[PDB]
DNA sequence: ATTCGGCCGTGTACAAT
RNA sequence: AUUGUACACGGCCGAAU
């Protein structure tokens, strides 16, 4: 043992220079899609490469700021059929409507919502990470509503119902009430289950395909060694 | 394929009067404060404390009452001591502080209220009234009545012995290998709105001591008030230490965040080099600012035996200013491990530093040890807030008093009554 | 201005010795 | 408010140019 799995998928390949279009900042500028504001640029990496074709090494300042929205960007494209990607931009919001027979379905709807992160170290590796969120949401109306907001409407002992079941699909307690004990390792299990069959690959690795090269995402978590030093 | 170091066994609480009480051990520190008391044993002139409430005649009260005796009498070692009980009769606040005006004049130097409802308002209207005058301990009724008044009571009567000017417990953290003086920092948001307080740390006895603290500064005085305090820790170690800053001068923030330069670490820097112009603070100074934060979309897998939880200590990055630290494990039980949700560990973040790239990864680690010693210095109950003790003081701080003028109760500041100092009055 | 990272409040529960 | 740990909402505060 003596490893920490730290929430983080390697970037086990990606190109080693990336076509980036640097551009002069214009004030007009959209969040849009591949286009990233570093600096005072905008940098039209990958789609939109049309006007300067140049290119940026490994070791360039640019390429770990702009290759984080690059590679959200390539991501937010191969997605399976359940899921729908809510809102991209710091982050990319993979939502799920779940469907597990549990306990007073009929009266309120639980939702799956990955929060799609991304983090860089050392400037030589990189990695993608993922946060659940489930949402609360009253299935015959669809709005956001808390355990304590419902109460004696939709049913007093229904907070018993919803609740139980919101920490047994988060993988914190029991189906019943109760805590177990493998509630760390359930709470990942989950996370690498529902990124697999989210980006539409139940392989261990998804080769997306981008304007530059192929990127390939071990949608494992990342191992951190045990050294002392 | 970053890197994780643990901090070496250790941190074993010390209560005086020597002790080898092992931490993340309920059982066991309750059995040694039992066996052995509390660090600095909190005897006043009335040895008599009252218990303020509205019942008569419940079983509850009753057994609560007994609960308080059998066990201050025994863990908390306030010797000469009796239970007195004072009775309101309703609810409305102005009558609980008629109640208690008639303990406060008998004189007893502890009163644990009991509240009948969970009431907001009056209860902090009344806790700034009866924390600026005596050591109490308000709690309610509803919530008494549902669980065990065992695993209650015990963590009710160590804050208790905490607010009554004692030190339940006190941290094996050696003079070195730590910072001289720590400034934390943390914060409450109220109507979206930052509201900071400062934990300053002295080594008053060459051991880690809280030894006073500073009351709510808005953001816009928050830089101002850093670089008095800056000077006013220096100020106060001199007083009562001949010794220097060998080691830092280090801070702790959290609920903010600050700047790389024209900011928190400028008016360290600036104020650092008026200190040494002064002969104040060696010219091997270390500034190392930090920053804290609690929730962020990392998690961690520890160790599969461990609950597959992160053990006591863990360092996972390097050479990037982010790390992250893990202080609550599992409690280590008769059975084996607590059975615990999924925790969300602590990150750590050097936004600025001036350690030069001599011995960075050493002096890393210098703070990083601290904190998690500094985290377990929180007296509130028998389990520790996965904050160091200068962010958990702060931010208890800071709510208790936004609470208090929120409501336009009794107005509370560490500044203006000398008394609260080396006193818990805000947990 | 955007990217990127958090961040603390009020109410459900769970459990320690 | 015995404490924490979690949780869901509501509202969000600020790192880097």
Known sequence: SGILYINIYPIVNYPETIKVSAIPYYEEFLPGKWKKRIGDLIYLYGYGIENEFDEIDNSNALFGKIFRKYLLDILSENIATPWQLKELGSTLRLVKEITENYEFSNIIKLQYELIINVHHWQNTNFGIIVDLKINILDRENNQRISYTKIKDKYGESVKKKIWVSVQAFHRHLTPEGKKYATAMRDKFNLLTGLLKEAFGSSEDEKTFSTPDGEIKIVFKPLEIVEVSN | ?427
């Open chain 2, 1 to 427: 394929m970053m890197e994780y170091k643990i901090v070496e066994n250790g941190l074993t609480y010390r209560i005086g009067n020597g002790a080898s009480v092992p931490i993340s051990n309920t059982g066991e520190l309750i059995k040694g404060l039992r066996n052995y008391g509390p660090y600095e044993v909190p005897s006043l002139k009335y040895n008599q404390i009252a218990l303020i409430h509205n019942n008569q005649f419940s079983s509850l009260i009753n057994q609560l009452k007994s609960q308080i005796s059998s066990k201050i009498d025994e863990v908390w070692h306030i010797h000469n001591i009796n239970i007195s009980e004072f009775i309101y009769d309703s609810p409305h606040f102005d009558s609980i502080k008629s109640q208690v005006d008639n303990a406060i004049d008998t004189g007893v130097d502890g009163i644990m209220l009991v509240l009948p409802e969970y009431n907001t308002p009056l209860y902090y209207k009344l806790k700034s009234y009866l924390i600026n005058s005596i050591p109490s301990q308000f709690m309610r009724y509803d919530i008494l009545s549902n669980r065990n008044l065992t695993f209650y009571v015990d963590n009710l009567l160590v804050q208790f012995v905490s607010k009554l000017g004692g030190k339940p417990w006190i941290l094996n953290v050696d003079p070195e290998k730590g910072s001289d003086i720590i400034i934390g920092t943390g914060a409450t948001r109220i109507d979206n709105v930052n509201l900071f307080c400062f934990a300053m740390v002295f080594k008053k006895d060459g051991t880690m001591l809280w030894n006073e603290i500073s009351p709510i500064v808005t953001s816009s005085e928050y830089l101002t008030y850093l670089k008095s305090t800056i000077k006013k820790v220096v100020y106060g170690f001199k007083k009562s230490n001949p010794d220097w800053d060998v080691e830092k001068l280090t801070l702790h923030v959290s609920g903010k965040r600050p700047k790389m330069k024209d900011g928190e670490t400028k008016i360290l820097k600036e104020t650092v080099e008026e200190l040494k112009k002064q002969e104040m603070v060696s010219r091997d100074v270390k500034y190392a600012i930090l920053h804290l934060n609690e929730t962020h979309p990392f998690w961690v897998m520890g160790d599969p035996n461990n609950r597959f939880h992160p053990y006591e200590g863990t360092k996972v990055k390097l050479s990037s200013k982010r790390y992250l630290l893990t202080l609550l494990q599992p409690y280590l039980k008769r059975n084996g491990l607590e059975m615990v949700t999924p925790i969300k560990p602590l990150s750590v973040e050097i936004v600025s530093d001036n350690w030069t790239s001599e011995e960075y990864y050493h002096n890393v680690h210098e703070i990083l040890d601290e904190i998690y010693y500094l985290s377990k210095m929180n007296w509130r109950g028998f389990r520790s807030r996965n904050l160091p003790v200068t962010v958990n003081y702060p931010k208890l701080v800071a709510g208790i008093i936004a609470n208090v003028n929120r409501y336009g109760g009794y107005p509370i500041n560490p500044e203006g009554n000398r008394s609260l100092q080396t006193n818990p009055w805000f947990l």
